[PDB]
């Protein structure tokens, strides 16, 4: 319901950046960088949910999902 107080602690909003390689083909996998956006403390053992990676033309060129590796 729209009127409800949700105070989460295990969820962080993140921005995902990636590089589209030359001659990229569908089904191929690429590395991504995940960066927190606001007042989050750590992303040490987090998991990235389904994220569509848009280009400059605002079209989906890849889908991102996996486990983050943070140095610590």
Instruction: Using CB under 8 A, list all residues that contact another protein.
Output: 49-52, 60
CB of 52 to another protein, least distance (A): 6
Nearest approach, Cβ of residue 25 and another protein (Å): 19
Nearer to another protein, 47 or 72 (CB): 47
Encoded tokens for 14: 């993140």
* Those residues with Cβ within 8 angstroms of residue 50's Cβ, 6 or more apart along the chain or in another chain: 63, 64, 65
Beta partners for residue 36, in sequence order: 14
Cβ–Cβ < 8 Å for 35, 15 = yes
Pick 28 or 59: Cβ nearer another protein = 59
Minimum CB separation from another protein for residue 50, in Å? 5
């Amino acid at each position: 319901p729209t009127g409800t107080n949700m105070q989460l602690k295990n969820v962080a909003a993140v921005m995902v950046t990636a590089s589209y390689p030359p001659f990229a083909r569908q089904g191929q996998t690429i590395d991504v960088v995940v960066s927190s956006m606001g007042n989050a403390k750590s992303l040490r053992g987090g998991t990235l949910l389904m994220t569509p990676l848009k280009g400059v033309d605002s079209q989906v060129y890849a889908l991102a999902q996996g486990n983050i590796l943070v140095g610590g």
